[PDB]
Design a binder for this molecule. Structure first.
Ligand SMILES: CCCCCCCCCCC
Length: 110
Protein backbone atom coordinates (compact mmCIF):
# COMPACT_ATOMS: atom_id res chain seq x y z
CA UNK A 1 0.00 0.00 0.00
CA UNK A 2 1.26 3.43 -1.02
CA UNK A 3 0.06 6.93 -0.20
CA UNK A 4 0.42 10.30 -1.90
CA UNK A 5 -0.44 13.97 -1.44
CA UNK A 6 -1.31 16.47 -4.17
CA UNK A 7 0.90 19.27 -5.41
CA UNK A 8 -1.51 21.28 -7.61
CA UNK A 9 -0.36 22.47 -11.04
CA UNK A 10 -3.60 24.10 -12.42
CA UNK A 11 -4.97 27.19 -10.62
CA UNK A 12 -8.36 25.46 -10.00
CA UNK A 13 -6.44 23.54 -7.38
CA UNK A 14 -4.16 26.11 -5.69
CA UNK A 15 -6.64 26.25 -2.82
CA UNK A 16 -6.83 22.50 -2.25
CA UNK A 17 -6.31 21.70 1.50
CA UNK A 18 -2.85 20.26 2.16
CA UNK A 19 -3.85 17.36 4.40
CA UNK A 20 -5.63 15.22 1.84
CA UNK A 21 -3.99 11.79 1.81
CA UNK A 22 -4.69 9.32 -1.03
CA UNK A 23 -4.04 5.63 -0.50
CA UNK A 24 -3.97 2.61 -2.81
CA UNK A 25 -3.84 -0.91 -1.43
CA UNK A 26 -2.23 -3.31 -3.91
CA UNK A 27 -3.66 -6.43 -2.22
CA UNK A 28 -7.36 -5.55 -2.02
CA UNK A 29 -7.24 -2.76 -4.65
CA UNK A 30 -8.81 -0.22 -2.27
CA UNK A 31 -8.49 3.54 -2.86
CA UNK A 32 -9.28 5.94 -0.02
CA UNK A 33 -8.93 9.63 0.72
CA UNK A 34 -8.43 10.93 4.27
CA UNK A 35 -8.09 14.32 5.94
CA UNK A 36 -9.30 16.32 8.95
CA UNK A 37 -12.45 17.47 7.12
CA UNK A 38 -12.97 15.00 4.21
CA UNK A 39 -13.13 11.24 3.81
CA UNK A 40 -13.99 8.99 0.88
CA UNK A 41 -13.63 5.42 -0.37
CA UNK A 42 -13.42 5.11 -4.16
CA UNK A 43 -15.44 3.05 -6.52
CA UNK A 44 -13.16 3.22 -9.58
CA UNK A 45 -11.72 1.98 -12.87
CA UNK A 46 -8.10 2.30 -14.05
CA UNK A 47 -7.24 1.08 -17.54
CA UNK A 48 -4.74 2.15 -20.19
CA UNK A 49 -3.67 5.16 -18.10
CA UNK A 50 -7.31 6.32 -17.71
CA UNK A 51 -8.61 6.65 -14.16
CA UNK A 52 -12.15 7.41 -13.15
CA UNK A 53 -13.56 7.14 -9.68
CA UNK A 54 -16.44 8.06 -7.36
CA UNK A 55 -15.21 8.76 -3.78
CA UNK A 56 -18.59 9.05 -1.93
CA UNK A 57 -17.28 12.04 0.00
CA UNK A 58 -18.05 13.27 3.55
CA UNK A 59 -17.23 16.89 4.43
CA UNK A 60 -17.35 18.86 7.70
CA UNK A 61 -19.58 21.92 7.57
CA UNK A 62 -17.78 25.24 7.99
CA UNK A 63 -14.36 23.62 8.05
CA UNK A 64 -13.16 24.93 4.70
CA UNK A 65 -12.81 28.35 3.13
CA UNK A 66 -15.03 29.03 0.09
CA UNK A 67 -12.01 28.70 -2.23
CA UNK A 68 -11.04 25.37 -0.67
CA UNK A 69 -14.58 24.03 -1.12
CA UNK A 70 -14.65 24.92 -4.82
CA UNK A 71 -11.24 23.30 -5.37
CA UNK A 72 -12.30 20.10 -3.55
CA UNK A 73 -15.65 19.98 -5.47
CA UNK A 74 -13.92 20.47 -8.76
CA UNK A 75 -11.34 17.80 -7.95
CA UNK A 76 -13.86 15.06 -7.21
CA UNK A 77 -15.93 16.07 -10.26
CA UNK A 78 -12.83 15.79 -12.44
CA UNK A 79 -11.87 12.39 -10.99
CA UNK A 80 -15.39 11.12 -11.77
CA UNK A 81 -15.26 12.37 -15.35
CA UNK A 82 -11.85 10.75 -15.82
CA UNK A 83 -8.18 11.74 -15.89
CA UNK A 84 -4.99 10.28 -17.29
CA UNK A 85 -2.32 9.13 -14.88
CA UNK A 86 1.34 9.43 -16.01
CA UNK A 87 3.78 7.54 -13.77
CA UNK A 88 7.51 7.09 -14.20
CA UNK A 89 10.34 4.64 -13.62
CA UNK A 90 12.45 6.95 -11.42
CA UNK A 91 10.11 7.39 -8.47
CA UNK A 92 6.45 7.15 -7.41
CA UNK A 93 5.32 10.61 -8.59
CA UNK A 94 2.22 10.53 -10.84
CA UNK A 95 1.00 13.39 -13.05
CA UNK A 96 -2.75 13.81 -13.38
CA UNK A 97 -3.61 15.08 -16.85
CA UNK A 98 -6.81 16.24 -18.47
CA UNK A 99 -7.82 18.48 -21.39
CA UNK A 100 -4.34 18.94 -22.70
CA UNK A 101 -2.78 20.02 -19.39
CA UNK A 102 -1.28 18.78 -16.17
CA UNK A 103 -3.83 19.42 -13.46
CA UNK A 104 -1.81 18.20 -10.50
CA UNK A 105 0.86 15.82 -9.31
CA UNK A 106 0.80 13.09 -6.72
CA UNK A 107 3.92 13.04 -4.55
CA UNK A 108 4.55 9.92 -2.48
CA UNK A 109 4.22 10.21 1.28
CA UNK A 110 2.35 12.15 3.85
C1 LIG B 1 -2.08 2.94 -9.12
C2 LIG B 1 -3.27 3.81 -8.76
C3 LIG B 1 -2.86 4.91 -7.74
C4 LIG B 1 -3.71 6.17 -7.92
C5 LIG B 1 -4.46 6.51 -6.64
C6 LIG B 1 -4.86 7.98 -6.64
C7 LIG B 1 -6.34 8.15 -6.93
C8 LIG B 1 -6.56 9.20 -8.01
C9 LIG B 1 -7.01 10.51 -7.37
C10 LIG B 1 -5.85 11.48 -7.20
C11 LIG B 1 -6.28 12.76 -6.52
Amino acid sequence: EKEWHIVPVSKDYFSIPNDLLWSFNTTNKSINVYSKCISGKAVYSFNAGKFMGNFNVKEVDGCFMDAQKIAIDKLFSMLKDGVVLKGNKINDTILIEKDGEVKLKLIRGI
